[PDB]
Amino acid sequence: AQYEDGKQYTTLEKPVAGAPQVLEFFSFFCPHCYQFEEVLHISDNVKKKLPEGVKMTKYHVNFMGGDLGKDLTQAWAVAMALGVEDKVTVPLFEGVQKTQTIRSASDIRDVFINAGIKGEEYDAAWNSFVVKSLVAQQEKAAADVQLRGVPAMFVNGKYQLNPQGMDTSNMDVFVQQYADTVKYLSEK
Ligand SMILES: O=C(O)c1sc(CCCc2ccccc2)nc1-c1ccccc1
């Protein structure tokens, strides 16, 4: 067929009950994730093709970058709690990988301050149990799919995107094939 289990996607042996509809995992330490977000804009092109009533979830992971990787997962939780993802995604990717000016939790915090999140608002979120819960949520979803690498994307806790089994020749073609595959999967 045109879409095949094992080709553009794979099928989890242990499907995940109740998982988010479209679930993306990334790390601000992950160079391929930088490309996905800054150059390919995968998340946004997937969204632009998703059926109505399907929501996209994006979680950070701990397994890259050691101590700072874990701080970034907490900072992504802060970004979600405040709803400022679109304000800090780029400067976090660039601070970690382009300028390499993010070396500590304080440098992470500076990015939010520079984006206009007030210092008191960031600190209260950072220390909140709402944020502790979002951290564990991100960790649980990654654990549930036994996530070893990023970037990754899952649909309905059943299908894992396989960007290698796609037509990877052209890149704009690549993005749209990735996005059409997610649409197809979300329609199964
Ligand atoms: O598995 C993956 O992550 C992907 S994604 C992709 C196509 C993206 C092209 C591109 C454009 C701009 C910047 C970076 C990359 N190819 C692969 C691949 C991986 C292992 C072996 C062969 C192919």
UniProtKB/Swiss-Prot annotation:
Annotated compartments: Periplasm
Matching Gene3D superfamilies: Glutaredoxin
SUPFAM superfamilies hit by this protein: Thioredoxin-like (SSF52833)
GO biological process, one term: cellular response to antibiotic
GO cellular component: outer membrane-bounded periplasmic space
Record's keyword annotation contains Signal: yes
Top-level taxon: Bacteria
Disulfide cross-links: 30-33
Residue ranges annotated for the Thioredoxin domain, each copy included: 1-131
Record bears the keyword Lyase: no
Pfam families recorded: DSBA
Alphabetized UniProt keyword annotations: Disulfide bond, Periplasm, Redox-active center, Signal
Disruption phenotype: Induction of the PhoP/PhoQ two-component regulatory system, suppressed by 50 uM CuSO(4).
MF GO annotations: protein disulfide isomerase activity; protein-disulfide reductase activity
Function, in words: Required for disulfide bond formation in some periplasmic proteins such as PhoA or OmpA. Acts by transferring its disulfide bond to other proteins and is reduced in the process. DsbA is reoxidized by DsbB. Required for pilus biogenesis. PhoP-regulated transcription is redox-sensitive, being activated when the periplasm becomes more reducing (deletion of dsbA/dsbB, treatment with dithiothreitol). MgrB acts between DsbA/DsbB and PhoP/PhoQ in this pathway.
Similarity comment text for this entry: Belongs to the thioredoxin family. DsbA subfamily.
Protein's name according to its UniProt entry: Thiol:disulfide interchange protein DsbA
Species of origin: Escherichia coli (strain K12)
